[PDB]
Amino acid sequence: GSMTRKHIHFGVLIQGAGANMNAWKHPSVPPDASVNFDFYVDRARRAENAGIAFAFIADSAYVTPKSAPHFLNRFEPISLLSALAVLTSKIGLVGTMSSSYSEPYNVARQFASLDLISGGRAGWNVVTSSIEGTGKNYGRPHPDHAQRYAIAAEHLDVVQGLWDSWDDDALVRDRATGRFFDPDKLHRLDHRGRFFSVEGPLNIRRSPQGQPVIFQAGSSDDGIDLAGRSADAVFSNGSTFDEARVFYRRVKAAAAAAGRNPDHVKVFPGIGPIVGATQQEADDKYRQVRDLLSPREALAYLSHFFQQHDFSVYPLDGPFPDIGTLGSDGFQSTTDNIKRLARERKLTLREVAYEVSTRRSNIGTSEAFIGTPEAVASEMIRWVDEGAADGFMLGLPVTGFGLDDFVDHVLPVLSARGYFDPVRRGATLRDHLGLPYKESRYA
Amino acid sequence: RKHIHFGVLIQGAGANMNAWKHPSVPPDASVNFDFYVDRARRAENAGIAFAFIADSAYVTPKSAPHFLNRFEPISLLSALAVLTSKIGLVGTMSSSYSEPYNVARQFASLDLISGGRAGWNVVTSSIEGTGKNYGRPHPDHAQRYAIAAEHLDVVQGLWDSWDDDALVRDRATGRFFDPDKLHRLDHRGRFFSVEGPLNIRRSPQGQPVIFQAGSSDDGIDLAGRSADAVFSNGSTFDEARVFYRRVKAAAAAAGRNPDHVKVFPGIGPIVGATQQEADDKYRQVRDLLSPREALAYLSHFFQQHDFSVLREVAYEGTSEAFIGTPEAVASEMIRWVDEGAADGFMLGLPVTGFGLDDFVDHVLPVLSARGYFDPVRRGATLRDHLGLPYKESRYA
Numbered sequence: 001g002s003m004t005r006k007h008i009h010f011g012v013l014i015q016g017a018g019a020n021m022n023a024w025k026h027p028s029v030p031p032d033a034s035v036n037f038d039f040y041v042d043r044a045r046r047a048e049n050a051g052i053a054f055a056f057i058a059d060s061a062y063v064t065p066k067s068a069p070h071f072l073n074r075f076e077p078i079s080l081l082s083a084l085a086v087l088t089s090k091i092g093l094v095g096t097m098s099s100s101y102s103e104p105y106n107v108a109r110q111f112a113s114l115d116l117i118s119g120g121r122a123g124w125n126v127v128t129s130s131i132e133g134t135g136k137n138y139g140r141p142h143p144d145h146a147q148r149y150a151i152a153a154e155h156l157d158v159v160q161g162l163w164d165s166w167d168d169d170a171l172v173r174d175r176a177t178g179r180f181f182d183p184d185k186l187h188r189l190d191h192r193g194r195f196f197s198v199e200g201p202l203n204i205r206r207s208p209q210g211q212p213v214i215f216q217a218g219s220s221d222d223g224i225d226l227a228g229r230s231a232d233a234v235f236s237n238g239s240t241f242d243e244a245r246v247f248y249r250r251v252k253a254a255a256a257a258a259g260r261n262p263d264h265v266k267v268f269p270g271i272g273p274i275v276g277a278t279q280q281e282a283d284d285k286y287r288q289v290r291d292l293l294s295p296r297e298a299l300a301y302l303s304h305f306f307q308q309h310d311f312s313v314y315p316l317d318g319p320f321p322d323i324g325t326l327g328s329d330g331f332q333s334t335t336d337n338i339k340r341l342a343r344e345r346k347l348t349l350r351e352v353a354y355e356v357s358t359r360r361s362n363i364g365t366s367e368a369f370i371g372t373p374e375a376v377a378s379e380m381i382r383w384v385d386e387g388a389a390d391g392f393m394l395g396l397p398v399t400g401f402g403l404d405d406f407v408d409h410v411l412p413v414l415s416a417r418g419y420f421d422p423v424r425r426g427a428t429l430r431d432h433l434g435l436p437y438k439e440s441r442y443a
Numbered sequence: 444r445k446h447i448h449f450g451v452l453i454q455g456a457g458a459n460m461n462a463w464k465h466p467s468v469p470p471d472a473s474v475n476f477d478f479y480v481d482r483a484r485r486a487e488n489a490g491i492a493f494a495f496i497a498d499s500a501y502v503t504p505k506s507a508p509h510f511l512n513r514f515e516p517i518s519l520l521s522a523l524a525v526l527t528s529k530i531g532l533v534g535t536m537s538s539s540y541s542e543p544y545n546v547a548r549q550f551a552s553l554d555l556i557s558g559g560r561a562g563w564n565v566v567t568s569s570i571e572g573t574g575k576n577y578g579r580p581h582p583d584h585a586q587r588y589a590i591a592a593e594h595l596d597v598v599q600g601l602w603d604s605w606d607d608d609a610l611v612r613d614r615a616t617g618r619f620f621d622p623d624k625l626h627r628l629d630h631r632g633r634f635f636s637v638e639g640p641l642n643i644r645r646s647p648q649g650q651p652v653i654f655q656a657g658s659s660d661d662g663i664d665l666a667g668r669s670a671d672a673v674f675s676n677g678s679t680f681d682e683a684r685v686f687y688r689r690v691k692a693a694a695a696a697a698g699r700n701p702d703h704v705k706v707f708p709g710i711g712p713i714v715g716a717t718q719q720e721a722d723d724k725y726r727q728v729r730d731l732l733s734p735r736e737a738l739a740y741l742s743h744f745f746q747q748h749d750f751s752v753l754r755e756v757a758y759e760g761t762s763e764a765f766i767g768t769p770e771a772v773a774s775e776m777i778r779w780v781d782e783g784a785a786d787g788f789m790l791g792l793p794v795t796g797f798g799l800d801d802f803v804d805h806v807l808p809v810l811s812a813r814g815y816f817d818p819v820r821r822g823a824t825l826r827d828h829l830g831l832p833y834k835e836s837r838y839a
């Protein structure tokens with residue numbers, strides 16, 4: 001009965017086995033979850049049946065023998081989302097694609113086709129920066145980072161221009177006269193910019209939501225500004241509450257400065273809640289998640305910060321050793337953080353290794369989102385009440401039990417408190433998110 | 444005794460540019476997903492080995508109805524995959540206007556989702572003006588074939604990134620993969636530079652099946668060296684046969700088994716119970732284009748001259764030989780296979796509704812009765828359906 005009760009929007013990041021890099025080891029998922037199509041269908045349906053607004057498929061296009069399991073082998077988003085569309089009915093279908101390594105005409109067509117097949121449920125997560133090295137797969141081994149935002153802005157402008165090629169009513173298909181379309185309702189783009197030259201028109205029409213929804217995750221000054229000028233929904237990962245609140249305020253002001261209505265720029269911080277009936281049960285699940293990293297893996301990553309020091313020689317459950325003499329390869333501030341922690345808390349080597357590891361391996365998991373359904377719901381409500389979120393991007397450490405727990409135990413508590421409507425009516429992704437139908441620039 | 448393979452081109456409403464007017468299809472067929480599902484399943488239930496989605500990426504006010512508005516192939520094929528089970532899934536994508544790493548990922552993903560049913564139709568030249576949508580208003584002219592060859596080499600190299608047994612995912616030890624079973628490409632050529640590895644594994648058929656449609660000397664050479672199946676464009680049996688022999692000769696010269704390069708002429712059969720009924724159906728389809736329209740299109744070629752003051756010229760494979768009774772049309776198809784013009788056929792039906800219904804219900808059963816078509820697709824992969832072996836990795 002809070003005076004500020006409102007529906008909290010949710011999306012779910014389906015990162016194969018889980019947001020935790022070692023989630024493939026957890027028994028609640030199949031080991032090949034990341035490239036197991038039926039697993040994605042099960043998880044998308046689980047989310048859809050709970051009233052989660054969209055499924056989000058993040059992406060990468062670069063591999064090394066050190067890449068995390070999900071980055072070593074994953075589905076490609078247009079193909080995956082198009083297959084999922086046809087086995088679902090309401091849930092949004094949001095896919096990552098890079099501005100630097102895609103032709104805008106192809107992006108426009110592939111996302112427009114997903115949008116039409118799905119009945120207006122497509123979203124495009126516009127990625128401005130890619131993993132370092134990605135350019136090596138596209139004949140551009142040294143990208144000019146300084147231009148990555150200018151490139152992305154123009155690329156997006158081209159895609160959206162192409163999406164307005166065909167007025168909603170252009171395709172007349174008059175069998176009496178033989179007139180298939182009204183020529184004055186088809187538009188050329190004639191884009192000639194610094195980075196792209198694209199004449200158009202596009203060869204596919206607009207969807208029941210007008211155009212696909214634009215997601216972005218810029219965090220730099222330029223990133224936030226691009227989001228304010230061009231995103232419908234903005235996400236993050238790893239933020240504390242105070243950080244998220246600053247981010248929320250900056251994105252909304254950036255929207256207002258661009259002459260847009262900030263009410264229609266949704267902010268969705270990433271979180272990875274872990275719930276149990278008691279704090280003890282939540283904590284046990286969190287320990288399970290922690291132990292997905294073996295002791296050796298925890299130590300190998302500590303070794304990284306101390307010039308490849310071999311920490312395997314020390315007893316795991318003995319005190320963290322006096323390694324103060326050891327240097328670091330430019331991570332001296334991190335090694336200082338590690339040593340301060342070890343000294344201020346009487347930590348063992350195991351506790352230090354996992355502190356470092358577990359924190360970094362689950363960046364959207366903080367202790368405020370670990371506990372009982374009521375406590376975890378209360379924290380989500382707090383983030384929304386206090387202006388850090390309009391909704392959340394769920395990045396669950398393990399996609400199996402993580403999502404099951406969340407949908408079975410958290411959502412019903414939120415619903416009971418007036419902060420989640422599981423049966424929001426709406427054909428389209430825009431409808432779910434409370435965004436207005438996207439009219440053509442030529443309407 | 445000698446199984447004839449079939450693919451079906453699903454060109455929305457039909458191969459006839461005015462197919463949208465025909466009552467056996469919905470007016471919006473070309474962008475009606477449920478209609479593509481219905482047609483794909485109709486073909487699949489009949490034992491047709493693959494659905495083929497052709498493509499374009501340039502539009503003008505004068506473009507044909509299907510070219511004005513169509514689905515994109517990766518998205519369409521991936522949606523069709525999960526509503527079908529056996530049928531092959533073949534999509535056009537251009538070598539000139541796509542990044543090979545993206546092509547590799549998109550087709551490998553389709554391949555994996557579909558259980559090994561993907562095919563890629565590699566198009567070397569696109570429709571004139573396509574380059575204006577990709578910042579290259581006057582593209583490669585001579586070097587389209589060299590770009591296509593290197594692009595394909597990159598994609599196939601990328602598809603062998605992951606040995607079939609590399610992803611051990613051993614929960615007892617925590618070893619996710621064998622690092623010696625993952626390969627970099629490190630391709631540095633004239634047109635492309637791509638390091639690899641790809642971030643997706645190989646499918647149950649190894650790699651997607653490669654289709655090509657080259658007709659020039661360079662086209663034929665490329666197909667003989669690198670195609671698994673080749674689409675042929677003959678309006679006549681003699682043309683088809685000259686083409687077929689050239690492709691098989693190019694395969695031998697490339698050191699390959701010519702029987703593993705399958706040649707599929709495009710045909711559009713029109714059947715009826717009698718020759719008269721078949722001819723009536725032909726006229727009906729032909730009449731979807733008004734003589735006024737046809738003579739107007741003709742006029743644009745010959746200096747805007749008014750030719751109203753010729754019919755066959757104006758309008759102009761369905762041959763005449765593929766217009767007739769089910770038995771006669773089956774006999775002609777059998778003749779093309781037995782006399783060395785075809786290993787199978789790509790069905791480009793004038794209207795995808797009645798055309799496919801007639802073909803599957805009346806012609807295929809005749810071919811089966813004569814020993815030229817096993818309607819049961821027993822294998823799982825597109826390679827299986829086409830009689831091709833599993834594609835082992837270059838590193839196997």
